Amino acid sequence: MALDANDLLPPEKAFVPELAVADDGVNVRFRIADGYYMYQAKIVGKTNPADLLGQPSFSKGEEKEDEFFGRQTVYHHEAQVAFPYAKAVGEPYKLVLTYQGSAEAGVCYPPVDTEFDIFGNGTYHPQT
């Protein structure tokens, strides 16, 4: 709240996962702290009952040059992924999210994966 930037704050609080459940699909908008960046090529996100999802619709950020990955699309603050269902059924679905990235300070955090159960609540947050 008073900062949310740099490497002074741990990843557990450096990310604000705002879950927006709509009628068309599920939109996950996690606010990334100013200093951390995630790899769009390693971001895992999917929600469906029995694998009835079309495809993970990313918003696409900017390309980041690298020494090992060469260059990939990364998110440094902006993060929005929409999950459109391929089946229109009022069934309960699970949400699998995996946050993988690194910090510009030379810190490499593991892909903290959190699975959520969509039973109907609107907003969702990890119970850590």
Next chain:
Amino acid sequence: MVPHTLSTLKTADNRPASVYLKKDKPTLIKFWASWCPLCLSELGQTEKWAQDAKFSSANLITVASPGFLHEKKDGDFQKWYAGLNYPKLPVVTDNGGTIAQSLNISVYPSWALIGKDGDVQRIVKGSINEAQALALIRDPNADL
């Protein structure tokens, strides 16, 4: 405490962690990620630093939890190192994250300083440096 469990920690070489957990010497557990750019470059540094005469005063080891934090599952991680370089890397396999969970490891690298009595004396989340190492040698309370 859990001394028996700590001694059950097998490395990617299939050897017990006891090889670096004896003689009443301080231990330094460093966590890392397999498929990470930053960790990849640091891997060479870990070996280089571990070979330093000054760093030979502490048992510096690299531990990873197969299957934990979405990392490589058990049976895949040890196989990964088997095809890697550096035939002298003290890589330990923490099945389930017995060490990672107990220290609430959410970000790498993680530097766990174990005292000569076999207890966690210090825990740092991030990266260390030479000046910091010297400070630790002077006072173990000199965090960050």
